[PDB]
Structures are given as C-alpha cells and as structure tokens.
Design an enzyme around this catalytic site. Structure first.
Site, PDB file in Angstrom:
ATOM      1  N   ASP A  84      -1.846  -0.538   5.968  1.00 38.70           N
ATOM      2  CA  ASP A  84      -2.234   0.396   7.365  1.00 38.70           C
ATOM      3  C   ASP A  84      -3.611   0.531   7.510  1.00 38.70           C
ATOM      4  O   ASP A  84      -4.112   0.919   8.720  1.00 38.70           O
ATOM      5  CB  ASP A  84      -1.593   1.765   7.280  1.00 38.70           C
ATOM      6  CG  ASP A  84      -2.377   2.636   6.258  1.00 38.70           C
ATOM      7  OD1 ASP A  84      -2.234   2.373   5.001  1.00 38.70           O
ATOM      8  OD2 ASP A  84      -2.766   3.706   6.736  1.00 38.70           O
ATOM      9  N   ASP A 144      -0.065   5.439   0.782  1.00 40.93           N
ATOM     10  CA  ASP A 144      -0.586   6.219   1.893  1.00 40.93           C
ATOM     11  C   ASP A 144      -0.636   5.695   3.312  1.00 40.93           C
ATOM     12  O   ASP A 144      -1.433   4.586   3.079  1.00 40.93           O
ATOM     13  CB  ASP A 144      -1.593   7.103   1.392  1.00 40.93           C
ATOM     14  CG  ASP A 144      -1.737   7.981   0.444  1.00 40.93           C
ATOM     15  OD1 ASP A 144      -1.598   9.326   0.513  1.00 40.93           O
ATOM     16  OD2 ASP A 144      -1.644   7.726  -0.655  1.00 40.93           O
ATOM     17  N   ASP A 152       0.937  -1.200   0.014  1.00 39.46           N
ATOM     18  CA  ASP A 152      -0.022   0.053   0.055  1.00 39.46           C
ATOM     19  C   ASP A 152       1.029   1.141   0.015  1.00 39.46           C
ATOM     20  O   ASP A 152       2.059   1.352   0.349  1.00 39.46           O
ATOM     21  CB  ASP A 152      -0.988  -0.046   1.230  1.00 39.46           C
ATOM     22  CG  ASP A 152      -1.948   1.187   1.495  1.00 39.46           C
ATOM     23  OD1 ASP A 152      -2.546   1.624   0.377  1.00 39.46           O
ATOM     24  OD2 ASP A 152      -1.840   1.794   2.512  1.00 39.46           O
TER      25      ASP A 152
HETATM   26 MG   LIG Z   1      -2.829   3.192   3.554  1.00 38.02          MG
END
Ligand SMILES: [Mg+2]
Ligand SMILES: [Cl-]
Length: 265
Positions: A215, A38, A36
């Site tokens: 995240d 961001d 991933d």
């Molecule tokens: Mg993310």
C-alpha cells in the site's frame, strides 16, 4: 567445461507488462505470496500500537501457507517480532524492517544494523526534535527509526528536513524511506524488493510465480521485483503505483485471498 542446466520453471502463470485483472484463481502450489502488513492485510491505525488485527487475517494467511506448501512471507516495515506478536503463526517467513531483518523458511534470522552507534546518535537528535514538537511520535524499531507526524500534519516539513539531514550525515550507512505520515530511517542497501528476491532464491519460493501486495512507497520495490519475475503486483488503495493490479481497500484485498483459498480448498 561446465554447463547451467535448468529444470522447467515450476511457474505455470506469467503476467505480461500491462495492467491486469486479478485472477479468479491461482495454482497455489506454484505461486509465491509476499504481503505487506499495515495498510495491506490490516487497516492503518492512528499510531502503530493501535492496529486491530481481525481473526480473519491469521486464518487466511495460514490457509494460504498450507495450500501453497509454505510459500507465503510477510514483507513489512514492522519488525519480525511484531509480526509474530500479531499473527502468531510459528515459523512463518518474515522480512521485517523493510528488509533489514529476514527469517527464512528454515527459521534462520539475519539482521543488519542492530546496535549501530550511529543509529543511537540519530535517535538522540530525533528525540530532541519530538520534544520540541508535540504530536510527532518517534518510534524506535531496533535497527531502524520511524518519525511519525500523522497527529501533527503541520510538522511534515520539519520532519522531512530533520530526517533528510540526519541521513545525509550518515549517507554511506543509512537511507530515507518516506511513508504515509511517516519518515523512516533504515540501513542502506536493504529493501523490500531485495528481500523478495532473496526469498525467491530459496525453497519453497524459488521458481514460483510471485504475488506482491502493498500500500505504500516502500512496497513499490516489491512490485518491481514481482513484475520483473513476471508475477502479479497488487496496490491496495489510492495512489500512483507500478503495481499491475489495484484493489480499493484492505477488505477488498482480503476478499481476493479468500477467493484464491476457496478455489484451492
Ligand atoms: Mg503498509
Ligand atoms: Cl523497500
């Protein structure tokens, strides 16, 4: 009459179903890496347009791509063009928009849901919503939409109700993807797990041990597919997760990749 003969799988490492310590090194040419963007390789910013990509990020991703012989992909909620704008790594495999678009290792790009008239109707209702609620931000992402409320946390309830209602109006074609201070509306039937599984059916990823780092809630489907294939799932930051390993921060995850690279070359 016909058989199904397999070659011995190129993966030389398997992780069991338990919490795991992040290894010192990995056989980079037998490992597949899915990241991933961001909040994972780069810090989350107050708005999507405000992220800061340190020069270390493209250098580390490209070195991992060299040492693994191409088996690195970004699996992001951003579009592919956005990822290209920040890494400028030509020909990097990217699944964008939570899997709604995917560029494979040949450079072929598949998209679903672009120019769908229902998305334009959803967008018009959300535009009227953020007009009535300062601090909310409507981000239009091609075939998907993101309803942000990081700068209007008191409006989480109205954001959820509006997005849930519009998705229900088109429940056969669209699904809701909650995230940190955001509700995203995206085409039904694609997700980060399916995108990882599609990469793992193609060269150079096929047969390798997968690593997935993420995240947010969308990344749990990536952790699921990495775990099902006996790989290594890494949750970045706090929160309940099905990931087998966890790091404290983007910097700490960055440091793990840097060690794997150094141990390789
Ligand atoms: Mg993310
Ligand atoms: Cl997903």
């Amino acid at each position: 009459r016909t058989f199904a003969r397999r070659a011995r799988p190129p993966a030389a490492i398997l992780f069991s179903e338990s919490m795991q310590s992040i290894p010192l090194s990995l056989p980079l040419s037998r490992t597949a890496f899915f990241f991933d963007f961001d909040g994972t390789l780069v810090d989350l910013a107050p708005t999507p347009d405000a992220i800061q990509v340190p020069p270390d990020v493209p250098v580390l991703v490209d070195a991992l791509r060299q040492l693994s012989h191409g088996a690195v992909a970004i699996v992001s909620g951003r579009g592919i063009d956005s990822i290209d704008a920040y890494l400028n790594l030509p020909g990097l495999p990217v699944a964008g928009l939570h899997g709604a678009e995917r560029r494979d290792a040949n450079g072929d790009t598949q998209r679903i849901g672009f120019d769908d008239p229902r998305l334009l109707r959803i967008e018009r209702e959300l535009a009227a919503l953020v007009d009535r609620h300062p601090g909310m931000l409507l981000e239009i992402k091609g075939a998907a939409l993101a309803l942000h409320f990081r700068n209007a946390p008191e409006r989480e309830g109205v954001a959820r109700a509006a997005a849930e209602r519009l998705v229900a109006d088109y429940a056969d074609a669209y699904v809701l993807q909650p995230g940190k201070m955001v509700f995203e509306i995206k085409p039904k039937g694609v997700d980060k797990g399916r995108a990882v599984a599609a990469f793992l059916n193609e060269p150079p990823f096929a047969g390798r041990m997968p690593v997935f780092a993420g995240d947010d809630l969308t990344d749990e489907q990536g952790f699921a597919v990495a775990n099902a294939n006996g790989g290594l799932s890494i949750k970045v930051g706090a929160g309940d997760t099905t990931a087998r390993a966890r790091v404290d921060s983007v910097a700490a995850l960055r440091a793990q990749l840097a060690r794997w690279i150094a141990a390789g070359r």
